[PDB]
């Protein structure tokens, strides 16, 4: 669209960055990330550690998980695998459990610098309603 509804200035910074990327690269990943950055909070539901742990199963354990939402901790998950996740926000228990398992935590600008086009990324959405 024309403007994000968010008043977070850093969100608008991410929107400017991914507008530039979507314009100057032929990568559908950047366009999808920009579209999800424009979207509202109810349309960006929280993604739990267990849902990522399920999706990191076949050959995606070496891929970088990208979540345009907040990753939340799941108490049902007893063992957290090693994971490189790039998300808007992390809850304190989720970030602590990811880093305690040898994994890593990323923001979207570090993703845009390390992976400008989204090569070998795993885009994950949270459950609707």
């Amino acid at each position: 669209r024309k403007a994000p509804k968010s008043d977070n200035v850093y969100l608008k910074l991410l929107v400017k960055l991914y507008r530039f990327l979507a314009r100057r690269t032929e990568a559908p990943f950047n366009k999808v990330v920009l579209r999800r950055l424009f979207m509202s909070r109810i349309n960006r539901p929280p993604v739990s550690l267990s849902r990522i742990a399920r999706n990191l199963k076949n050959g995606n354990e070496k891929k970088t998980v990208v979540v345009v939402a907040t990753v939340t901790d799941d108490n049902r998950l007893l063992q957290v695998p090693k994971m490189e996740v790039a998300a808007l926000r992390f809850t304190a228990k989720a970030r602590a459990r990811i880093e305690a398992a040898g994994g890593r935590t990323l923001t979207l600008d570090q993703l845009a610098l390390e992976k400008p086009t989204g090569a070998n990324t795993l885009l994950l959405r949270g459950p609707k309603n």
Binding site: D7, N8, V9, Y10
Partner: protein, 50 residues
Amino acid sequence: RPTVTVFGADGKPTGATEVLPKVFSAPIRPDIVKHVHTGMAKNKRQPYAV
């Protein structure tokens, strides 16, 4: 920047420095500040009625 210099009573630096706290590297969010200031400026209000 890790350290901030300490100044004396004459305005010249003493030579000692202090470590800058983490709270100076906090996010600067004018929307949160606007919301909380709008709420907090109303809390010393005396009621009026006819």
